Design a protein around this ligand. Sequence first.
Ligand SMILES: O=C(COP(=O)(O)O)[C@@H](O)[C@H](O)[C@H](O)COP(=O)(O)O
Ligand SMILES: O=C(COP(=O)(O)O)[C@@H](O)[C@H](O)[C@H](O)COP(=O)(O)O
Lengths: 343, 343, 343, 343
Amino acid sequence: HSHPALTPEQKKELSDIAHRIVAPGKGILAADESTGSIAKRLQSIGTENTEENRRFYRQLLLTADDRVNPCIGGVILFHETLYQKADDGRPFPQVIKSKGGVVGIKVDKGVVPLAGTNGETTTQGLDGLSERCAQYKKDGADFAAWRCVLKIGEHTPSALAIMENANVLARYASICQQNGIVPIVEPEILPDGDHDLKRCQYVTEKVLAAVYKALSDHHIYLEGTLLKPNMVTPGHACTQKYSHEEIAMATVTALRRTVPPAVTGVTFLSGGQSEEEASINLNAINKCPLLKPWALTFSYGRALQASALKAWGGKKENLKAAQEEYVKRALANSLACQGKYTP
Amino acid sequence: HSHPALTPEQKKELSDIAHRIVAPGKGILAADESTGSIAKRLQSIGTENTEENRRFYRQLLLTADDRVNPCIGGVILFHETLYQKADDGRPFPQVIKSKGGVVGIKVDKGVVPLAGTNGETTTQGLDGLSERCAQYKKDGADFAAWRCVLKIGEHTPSALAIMENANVLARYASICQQNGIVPIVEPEILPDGDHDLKRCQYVTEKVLAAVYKALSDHHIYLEGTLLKPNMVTPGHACTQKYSHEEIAMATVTALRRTVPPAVTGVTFLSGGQSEEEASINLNAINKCPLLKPWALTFSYGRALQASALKAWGGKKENLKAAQEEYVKRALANSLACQGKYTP
Amino acid sequence: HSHPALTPEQKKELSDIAHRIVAPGKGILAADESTGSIAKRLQSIGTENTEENRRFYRQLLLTADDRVNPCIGGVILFHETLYQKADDGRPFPQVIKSKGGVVGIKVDKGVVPLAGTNGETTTQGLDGLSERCAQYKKDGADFAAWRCVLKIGEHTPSALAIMENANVLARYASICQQNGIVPIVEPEILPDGDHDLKRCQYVTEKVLAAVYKALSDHHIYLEGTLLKPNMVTPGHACTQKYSHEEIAMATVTALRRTVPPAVTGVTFLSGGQSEEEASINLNAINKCPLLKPWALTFSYGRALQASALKAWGGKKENLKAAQEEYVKRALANSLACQGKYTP
Amino acid sequence: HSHPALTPEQKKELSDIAHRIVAPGKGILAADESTGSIAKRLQSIGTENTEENRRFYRQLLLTADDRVNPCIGGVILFHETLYQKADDGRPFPQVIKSKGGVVGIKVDKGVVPLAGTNGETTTQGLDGLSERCAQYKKDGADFAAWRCVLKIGEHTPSALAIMENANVLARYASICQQNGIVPIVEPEILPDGDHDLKRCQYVTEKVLAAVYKALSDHHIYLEGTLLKPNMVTPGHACTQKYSHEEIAMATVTALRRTVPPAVTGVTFLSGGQSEEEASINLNAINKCPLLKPWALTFSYGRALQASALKAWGGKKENLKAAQEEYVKRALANSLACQGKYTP
Ligand SMILES: O=C(COP(=O)(O)O)[C@@H](O)[C@H](O)[C@H](O)COP(=O)(O)O
Ligand SMILES: O=C(COP(=O)(O)O)[C@@H](O)[C@H](O)[C@H](O)COP(=O)(O)O
């Protein structure tokens, strides 16, 4: 029966925020690398994993010149970062906002093993999520991030994996919208394996269909949501080669038959793709002749920081050289999400 | 796992047929009134329900002048009719085809009561449907019709009704596509009751979501399908009044959050709407500012024949006057499905 | 909500019939071999597949001396047989009944291929099943048979196969109970393959769980039903050997964690098991130390007729020798379903 | 596919623990009243809600004379209590154990509102539950408690409520079994409302069916689990009166058609029933002529402490009088779970 989960005013707030993030030419910078995640980053460039270093590396990205402004409609931060400040004592959420970006916050607590499965998982973080979202909202966050991981293999993703992960994404999304936070559903399908393009498109189609059915069961406002899916590509170990147009067609197709037009936008994850690779693919996708009723932009992390982190190396004197690489990719991906990339 | 239900060639055939039916400005004429259905029609105009009369009334519609050609992309026939001929010994499927229309055939066998429910039902017709489709395909049919009925009330549509009806529509759709027949999924939600616009949009959204999840589970090719849903409107007995723009917004909205863009088209059912009423609403719908990734056309029966049948009255001398009323509505609805309706 | 599918009087009738069939020491004789099924039988013994021969072979079994009376609580017949008569012009349903047996009728119309699957199927026969059941009930039938086939392989039974087959079994069961016919749910899992005991128990557990969840969704009266499942055994081509106690434990276990105690009884199918083999296994099952809240009897066909058909060979003079083999197995299985078999 | 969630040794440990708790004549004492729960208790008897008072009241129950030993097979504690000690510095888990009881621990974190529903909820507590269970196991706990609340009303329990609550109970159960903790599934259906016995039995049957289907999907070992359901009774505000035999029949029936015989036992919750009332009903239930393949015992809180708490009143001098009332109810319920009660 009709028992509204959201009021017209609440729907407007969520829809407004969602559109802002994926506005034309705009994308998302994923700087939510968790503890163990960012640790490896700083490691690859002989840099002590200290809170100060993390605060510096983050400030480095969030303070890049204004050339990045029209390219970044949103940036995801980890809990720690959301409460750090720039050298001028300015809170990071303020830095981002001052540059026209929307502040996002990762609210999930990592994946957990699914018993009785073949190395499959689901993710936690629902406990006290409501009050957490109410706080984050007060502290400048307007959208959240929650990653679910699925993988292609012999008997995976299993029916349990798909069903459980889809249900948890809906619970998370539900709680988010209750606190004025735009939830970004992220049902990532690992690119690991030797499977081909077809297998990926198939699993993506099945997974995405289950995801939105769950979202419907939990009464979630699609307009006030975003989707962070994997692009459709062959396994990393696949022997067969495919073109950028082929993965672009497979991607848009898989999305066309599963993602309702009501969904405000799609912010792809680079999932192990090189900076250039992820940009070209995003461009191809936006070039696909088919009809796309939702924004097809980016939500990259490594594909946006790889070069930067490298140019940084931990040396403070390398601040400019590092930021230049980032602004470079941001500009590159701002065009791609418009189908104008031209390297 | 990847076990193709359709080949690329099979998908092309189905997609091609689907697009033909809903090509710009084109709609569908529902002349599949069954035995007891068409019986009441002929009754309302003091006319014996004889096979010859039915053959005449049908010929009357299928032979209207060429003004109807660009307006009719498809017409659904009942079994009997599919094997009848025009006065010139020309098979009806040939008449339709010669005018550029695609021939459709109703394959369901009516609704059956769902035990343990409050007057709810599901529909049968799956037995030997495959061989039936193979035959119909050979005899000129390219798409099929199967109607499922749902109704809004205290505890209806129940979870069983929605789940069962959605599953049967998928089985039907699956068998159709296996025989080169484009299945038109028709999950009609009766307009009966005193419920309002909101209640209808809610039930439509929930029902449509279940429908496409089932279609996905049964591996059906969305591009090779059409959707024949009810427009979103208040109950027939609703006290509150709504405008054509209001039902147009409620309709497009309900569709935007449930119907994947891959679906080639949506052919609305008039469901008790007057000829004019159904035309204006279809126009409003196509006028809705929102983004519509699928064709929003018509699949009317009464809203296309009401006046004709009346002008006919059984008198053969009234052939011209009758056909004129039909051509009138066909032209009226061809514009509407383009958002250009006049008064 | 509470909308009774059955009245107390209707539930009593169904429960009563169900208990009668599986009363202590009683089992079921499956003589519902269809057209192509019984054809091979008569073939193996150089006998023309004529209606008269079928009528004779059937009469041969249904007229065996009274020693079989306490052993047979029910016998399933094919449509044809249900309307045939014994040499004395006595209708077969009357013969069976006069011997204290309940008459059953197969109402399904065979399996159909499931598109998009690896050789998987579902079964049809729901069309006009209601009126069919009303007739059969009038003509002496009190319970029905409907076989669904599932098979173990790489990716089978698939989620579609399990879900579809479980739903159809529920629709069938629902219609049956509406017409005073006790439905026997038969979710057979082919023993084909080289899988082991564990794999079978696993699939059986998963399949059986889905079956009863569907039965619940369709509001079916468990007490007024029976279950005709496959025993838990290794694939026919399995390399590993198992004892009668091992398959008995695997069987009872798989049933204990899926079959609600409300289910009046379980009538196992022999599924390619030799006459002796099926008897010993049924005995072991009834000997299992675990707690069994339902009757664990038989519903054999070949395991009950193999020897008979052979001793017959088509020769009318062999009537006695043939019936003796049948009575032999019936007596053998009457003990087994009591755990008193005496090899 | 076959990917064992539990080893034979793990299954044995869980099954063993489960049987111990519900051994003949034994029941469970629910002393897991949370913070706000036990607060009201101490309030009703003018007693400051201090940790010392709670420690005393708990010690009071866990140290009752040995007459309670054969009556208590298990007792559930709240986190705090699990780490408190008796006056002799003996850890509570040790007190319980020394008396032959199994120690249980509530691991859920309360109910949370389900958005888009009519006051419906689900419960949280899955985050870090694994490590929590590993710790509790080390600290003497062998089984856990997790309460899900459902309620009967106009459109409740809704499909979302039933589906979500059933899935969370399965996740909880899954994690528990991975850490050698026997999970007790508690899908409580509030007795609030003016509904009758029939409505309750219906909802209980539907809810219980969904619960076990979920448990199956998550591959949980039924033998290593217990069920804490509500007895089937009319709403608290129901106008119609029923006998103890009537609710006993409705209860056993609802359980017979939903709870697999593999489930080791059922520990009913008193849910607002008076001490006497809960005892008589438990007796009637065990007196029901129907077949019960699982233990039908108790898991009471108020129905076991009501009189005690009252006789205590906070006064230390009232220790004996208080414990006597508890031992009284424990003895009363030990008989009831055996069908030998006799007021
Ligand atoms: O003819 C129709 C044309 O539109 P569709 O809904 O078929 O598309 C509709 O108007 C329905 O048939 C109408 O409800 C007839 O119901 P009836 O009066 O016979 O009891
Ligand atoms: O007759 C039977 C008796 O037991 P039920 O399984 O019917 O209970 C079974 O033995 C099956 O019909 C058998 O697999 C026949 O298959 P077929 O050789 O014709 O290809």
